[PDB]
Each structure stands twice: as C-alpha cells, then as structure tokens.
Amino acid sequence: IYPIGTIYENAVNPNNPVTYMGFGSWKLFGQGKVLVGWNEDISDPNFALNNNDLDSGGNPSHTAGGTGGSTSVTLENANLPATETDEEVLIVDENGSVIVGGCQYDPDESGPIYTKYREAKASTNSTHTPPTSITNIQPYITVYRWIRIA
Amino acid sequence: IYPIGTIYENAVNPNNPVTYMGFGSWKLFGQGKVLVGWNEDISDPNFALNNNDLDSGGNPSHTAGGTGGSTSVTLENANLPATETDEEVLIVDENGSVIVGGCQYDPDESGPIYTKYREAKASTNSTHTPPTSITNIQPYITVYRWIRIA
Amino acid sequence: ENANLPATETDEEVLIVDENGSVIVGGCQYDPDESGPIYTKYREAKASTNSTHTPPTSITNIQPYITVYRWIRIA
Amino acid sequence: VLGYDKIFYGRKSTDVRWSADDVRFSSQDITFAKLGDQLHLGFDVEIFA
C-alpha cells in the first residue's frame, strides 16, 4: 500500500513505524521542512528544483526531497519602496531659488545664528540599521512525523 | 482503505503511483503547490472559498481546492513602518525660528554662493520601487505527490 | 514596524543641524523692509516619511498551496 | 586666528583653492570636533589650536 521510501506520518505516539504502525520502521523526513509537490516543471522557485539534488551541471531533476524556504527574512535597503518626505523640507542643489548666503552681513555678535550642518545624505534609522526581520511563514501543522523506511 | 481525496501521494519514485499502490490508478497532484488546511472553519482565512472554489455568489463550502500567497513579495508606500530620519533636519513652515532672508547683500557675488535648493520632499531609495522581495517560502522539502485517482 | 528597517540616507544632500556646521543662517536676516522675502525653512525636527503610515498593510507569507481538510482518524 | 566669536585656527588653505576647496574644508570642520587625532590626517595644511 505504502511504496518504497514511504511518504508517511503519525500524529501522536513516541515511536517509529515498528511499535505504532507496526509494519516497517520509520524516521522523520523533512524535519522542519514543509512538504510541497515536486512538479515535472522545474521552475517555481521553492516548488521547483532540489536544494539537495542538482546536476553537476546544476540541473536538479524534477524530484523530491528538494528544499526551499527558511525561518526569518530580514529587511535591507534593497527592500524598500521609493518614498517622499512628508512635508516641504530644503534639500541641497545648485539651481536653488533660496541662497543660504555667502557670508554674514552681521555687524553684531550675539543675535542668534545657527549652524545648519553640512549638506549630506540624510540619515534614516541608522540607530537600528540591521533591524527587525519578520517571520515569513504560516501557522504550523507540525507533528512528529515518522516516515517508514520501507 | 484509501478513497480518492485522502492524503494522496508517493514519496520518491518518479513514475506514477499505480506501479506500487497496486489498487487501481492514481493521478499526480500538487505541482507547484503545498498541502495546507482548508478547515470546516468557515470564516477562517484560507478555508472559505478556495480560489477556484466559489458559488456564483462567491460561496464555496468550507472546503478545498485551496490557494494563496507566494514566497517573495515587497512593499508599496503604504507598506512601510513609521519612518523618521535621525539627526534633526530643517523643513518649510510659516512658524519657524530660522530666518531665511529673501534678499540681502550678496553684493559681492564673490562670496561662496551656497544655495541649497527648494523646500521639498526628500526621496529615500528613489532609485527603486521594486525592493528586495523577502522569500515567504518556509523551510520546505519538495516531496513527490501523485494523488490517488481512487 | 518602525523597528524593522534598513538604515536609510536621502538620495541627495540636505542640511543637518550640527553646532560645527559649515553653512550659516546668519545672526539674523538683514530685513530692512517687509518686502525682502521672509520665510522659515523651519526649526529642525525629525524627518517625516509616511505618517500617512500608521501601522501598515502587510504582505502575505503562505505560498500557493492546496488548502484541504487533513483527515485525522479520531481514534 | 583670533576672533570675537572664537579663538580659533581655521582651515589655512594651501595649494590651489578651487571649487573643490569648499568640499575640502567641510572635512576639517568635523575634524575640529573629532578630537580623535586621526581623522583624514589632512595633507591640506590646517591647525586646530
């Protein structure tokens, strides 16, 4: 009924296919992996070609056991959309209609001035650069699955 | 013992599932897919009307033929946390402390004429809308599925 | 959520506020009349990017996959 | 130099001052607050005082 190298499971017991199922003996195939159909089509990225098996040319056969996916994906500046600031703020360019001035006609001393710092790249989130990486998956049907050897 | 529609597959062998299962015929399924629950839970996220599953009015059963999501995806502006750039930057207002000046002595054009350009919106990573698309594939061993025709 | 983010730096330059800063707003404008254009590029503050964003929309995870009824035999 | 604002040693430029003499100065500005004694190790002559 259950061919060579079973696709098999159990939801409950402690033990192998020998004690509970009783015909054969088992181990967990795909531990932490989440099963997906290996199509004769080799394309769809985590559904496609084996992350164990591949040719010496790289070609993984349409074939099973192949791996895809992992726990935690992180957000790097390759991942972000374009955006605008949320107001009118003064950026730095040489057509500008507002001239910061060459120098102070400033006969006094203590009438309050500023130091507008050097025009540079305007830094967001550099306090936490690497920060949070959200979980990329769906809720678990996960149970200790002993897949009968044969 | 195994009606058509129970968990229906074969783990390794390239060939169909008849050649072993020895009862009848079995037809391959799961190509570019995965086994998720469609629960009797009717209002559950994936369990109500599977993609092809609908009434004309939209109502399937609480039932199968399921689909949803894909591994890699990325943001639109409304996908973005609440961003603020660290070091304190000036912006437009009518309320401010910083006097611009609209005219002056710039009697000598000879001063360094440093004119930052207009008040505006500051583009972050404007180069690309198409961010990095985090794989939502989760650790996944592609396992062969030939579903039982009966 | 605003924790999660690469650090970012705006695609061209603009004026931080540091007390070593090169450019200078002057001790005051020289503002003889009202006709010399006033303004304020206003006091420094946080930057604002997407306060149109409160908590956002959330891009899906689970991948196209048969949603079926796992049949566990009750006992 | 001495000044009403501060007692300070400015950039004290050398070589040929060009459009890039400006951007050459901005580095020494931060170096005034650097205090690390390394910074750009400026070949363009300057003094912190």
Structure tokens at B3: 């009606």
Site from C4, C19, C53, C66 to mutate, B interface, most B CB atoms within 10 angstroms: C66
Q: Rounded to 5 degrees, what are φ and ψ at D28?
A: -70, -25
Query: Is residue A92 within 8 Å of B90, Cβ to Cβ?
Result: no
Local structure of residue B80 (DSSP, 8 states): S
Query: Is residue A106 within 8 Å of B103, Cβ to Cβ?
Result: no
Site from A104, A114, A118 to mutate, D interface, most D CB atoms within 10 angstroms: A118
Site from C13, C16, C18, C20 to mutate, D interface, most D CB atoms within 10 angstroms: C20
> Which residues share a beta bridge with A147?
A27
Long-range contacts of residues D43-49, Cβ cutoff 8 Å, at least 24 apart? D44/D11, D44/D13, D44/D14, D44/D15, D45/D12, D45/D13, D45/D14, D46/D9, D46/D10, D46/D11, D46/D12, D47/D9, D47/D12, D48/D9, D49/D7, D49/D8, D49/D9
Distance CA A105, CA B104 (A): 8
Structure tokens at A101: 């001035």
Distance CA D42, CA C41 (A): 34
> Cβ contact (<8 Å) for D4 and A118?
no
Strand B146-148, strand B26-28: pairing: antiparallel
| Experimental method of this PDB entry | cryo-EM
Give A132's contacts in chain B (Cβ within 8 Å): none
Q: In a 10 Å sphere around its CB, with 0-12 CB exposed, 13-18 middle and 19+ buried, how is residue C32 labelled?
A: exposed
Which among A73, C48, A68, A85 has a CA at the least distance from the CA of B82? Answer: C48
Distance from CA of A126 to the nearest CA of B (A): 7
In one-letter notation, the amino acid at residue A66 is: G
Distance CA B146, CA B37 (A): 18
Q: What is the CA radius of gyration of chain B?
A: 30
Distance CA B111, CA B53 (A): 73
In one-letter notation, the amino acid at residue D45 is: V
Q: Does C21 touch chain B (CB under 8 A)?
A: no
Angle at A100 between CA B116 and CA C48, to 5 degrees: 50
4-23 in chain C: CB under 8 A from chain D: 20-22
Using DSSP, state whether A148 is helix, strand or coil: strand
Structure tokens at B69: 């999501």
Query: Is residue A116 within 8 Å of B114, Cβ to Cβ?
Result: no
Distance CA B123, CA B138 (A): 33
**Residues of chain C by 3-state class (helix, strand, coil), percent to 5:** 0, 25, 75
Distance CA A98, CA C15 (A): 13
Angle at C60 between CA C55 and CA C63, to 5 degrees: 170
Distance CA A146, CA A18 (A): 10
Distance CA D7, CA D4 (A): 8
Structure tokens at B106: 């710039």
Query: Is residue B136 within 8 Å of B69, Cβ to Cβ?
Result: yes
Distance CA B13, CA A150 (A): 13
In one-letter notation, the amino acid at residue B141 is: I
Distance CA D19, CA B102 (A): 25
- CA atoms within a 13 Å half-sphere pointing along the CA-CB vector of D46: 21
Query: Is residue B35 within 8 Å of A140, Cβ to Cβ?
Result: no
Sign (positive or negative) of CA dihedral A122, A124, A130, A135: negative
Structure tokens at B48: 């109500």
Q: Does B61 touch chain C (CB under 8 A)?
A: no
Local structure of residue D2 (DSSP, 8 states): B
Q: What is the resolution of this structure in A?
A: 3.8
Distance CA A113, CA B25 (A): 87
In one-letter notation, the amino acid at residue A30 is: G
Distance CA B103, CA B94 (A): 17
> Cβ contact (<8 Å) for C21 and D29?
yes
Which among B25, B24, B30, B23 has a CA at the least distance from the CA of B7? Answer: B30
Query: Is residue B114 within 8 Å of A102, Cβ to Cβ?
Result: yes
Query: Is residue B92 within 8 Å of C44, Cβ to Cβ?
Result: no
Give A36's contacts in chain B (Cβ within 8 Å): 30, 32-34, 140-143
Using DSSP, state whether A20 is helix, strand or coil: helix
Query: Is residue B101 within 8 Å of C31, Cβ to Cβ?
Result: yes
Distances (CA, A) of D42 to A13, B126, D47: 73, 34, 10
DSSP string, A83-132: B--SS-EEB--TT-SS---SS----SSSS----B---EEEEES-SSSS--
Which residues, including other chains, have CB under 8 Å from residue D43's CB and lie 6 or more apart?
Answer: none
> Cβ contact (<8 Å) for C22 and D33?
no
Distance CA C6, CA B125 (A): 11
> Which residues share a beta bridge with B31?
A37
Structure tokens at C21: 């800063």
- CA atoms within a 13 Å half-sphere pointing along the CA-CB vector of A69: 31
* Option in B70, B89, B101 nearest C15 (CB): B89
Q: What is the helix (H) or strand (E) element at residue A45, kind and residue range?
A: helix A45-48
The residue of chain C with its CA nearest to that of D24 is C22
Structure tokens at C17: 């506020």
Number of residues written out for chain C: 75
Distance CA C31, CA C39 (A): 11
Q: Rounded to 5 degrees, what are φ and ψ at D26?
A: -55, -35
Q: Per DSSP, which regions of chain B are E strands?
A: 26-28, 35-37, 89-93, 119-120, 140-141, 146-148
Q: What is the helix (H) or strand (E) element at residue C43, kind and residue range?
A: strand C40-45
Distance from CA of A93 to the nearest CA of C (A): 8
Distance CA A102, CA B25 (A): 87
